[PDB]
């Protein structure tokens, strides 16, 4: 009558990488020196967002 | 996953020469003779201030 191959059973989940690994925002300052003068200063700062599952980051 | 250098460690110190090793300031007189004569006086003193870790000095 109807031979069966045994193959019509499924079952389906869905991926998605929709975001970059890190965001950055700068909040950087100034360097105001006089005309060929020696100094030092701190600049600022820049946050670093860590998103999703993520643990370990190597940047350059 | 990630595969680190290992360099990403550091240490800072800073260093500063901002004084020259004497200060002299003079405290010297006058010689006040006649006309063609023959003496002698003295004529005073000068201060040679010594600065930072400074033990020996060889001046001109
Ligand atoms: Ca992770
Ligand atoms: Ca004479
Ligand atoms: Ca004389
Ligand atoms: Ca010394």
Excluded: C, R
Aim: proline content about 5%.
């Amino acid at each position: 009558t109807t031979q069966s191959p045994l193959n019509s059973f499924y079952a389906t989940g869905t991926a998605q990488a929709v975001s970059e690994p890190i965001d950055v925002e700068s909040h950087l300052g100034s360097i105001t020196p006089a005309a060929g003068a020696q100094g030092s200063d701190d600049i600022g700062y820049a946050i670093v967002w860590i998103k999703d599952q993520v643990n370990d980051v190597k940047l350059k």
